[PDB]
């Protein structure tokens, strides 16, 4: 199931699940033009981490969750994941999905292990401790990417109003999970994915498969 | 508040709101460019009705609801409108809505009626009796149109999941009015809207002021 691509910067070597082969020579394409401009500086992820979430397959993906970038320090090309269960946004994700489920007791939480989600990074990486400072780099490959990614899943969530500003399928865009005085909209719009799926007649998500006890 | 344009062909004149003034140049050199080939053949709705809907207002709209193009037959220019009530597709969604609100006498019901909706087509025109027959000629000018409703309006629903499939807001892709065994998907689509309008601190639709007594 497994493929491979040659590049001509760093990481050198993409890995990819079949599922993603119609749009990799494209990409390569990309990669080779920007590359250069990405590894200049220190980047959340590293440069071996950039690709990483291409090796999930997606005809078994059905809710796509996305943030505009990594986070801005310790990324580990897994979007969301937190090792330390330290970053601000997963754990006011895990908060909102403990309300939503009455599970309280854990110690950490991961979007990835989710059966049916694919969580997602617009942006594959951000110049180390500047937020979306990578955006005109990533531009072609991250609509290629999404664009892609929307032809498997049934709902995208984005996170962040002001985030995605950038370039038909059911979409919400919600708050980012670290903004302020909004914890029932964040919490009802989790909710309202599953519902959305059910009248797609598609299976719900069991979004407690995140916890980690 | 109402602007003009002149065309090179039938109707020869659009009129249109202050709101879509940052589009109509674009439009009408859009318009200019592809009209003889609409006009060749008796449409629906006439071509001095084409443009009817960009008269409504935009800033005051908080949902477009969207179906492909026109009825075959006897179109007004506004969409899903049916002066006599005969039309499956509002027939379909008044009864949607009586399930939704408990009204359950009505002699008809218009979506343009109601405060904070715009109901839409995506092409402006059929050829009479076919459906879909002039999705070459409105491309752009559909393009343009939606692109310049998803800036005012924070829900995008859209009639017909295998209607559309032809190019960052909220958006469920719902079935059409006339699709069979889904009245519950239909019914509670309707009432997601709301939901994610209360989410994303909008005031809801009153969907009953649609009803004609």
Known sequence: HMNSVTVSHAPYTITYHDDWEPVMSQLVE?????????????????????????????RNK????????????????????????????????????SRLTGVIDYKGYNL???????????????????????????????????????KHVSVLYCLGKTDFSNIPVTTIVGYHPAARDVQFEKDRSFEIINVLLELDNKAPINWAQGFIY
Chains 1, 2 share one sequence.
């Open 30 to 58: 990309f990669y080779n033009e920007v590359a250069s401009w990405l590894l200049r500086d220190e980047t959340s992820p590293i440069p071996d981490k950039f690709f990483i979430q291409l090796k999930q397959p997606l």
């Open 112 to 150: 990835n292990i989710i059966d049916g989600v694919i969580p997602w990074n617009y942006y594959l990486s951000c110049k180390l401790g500047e937020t979306k400072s990578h955006a005109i780099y990533w531009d072609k490959i991250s609509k290629l990417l999404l664009q892609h990614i929307t």
């Open 62 to 97: 059905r809710v796509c969750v996305c943030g505009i970038d990594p986070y801005p320090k310790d990324g580990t090309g897994v979007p969301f994941e937190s090792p330390n269960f330290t970053k601000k946004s997963i754990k006011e994700i895990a908060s909102s999905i």
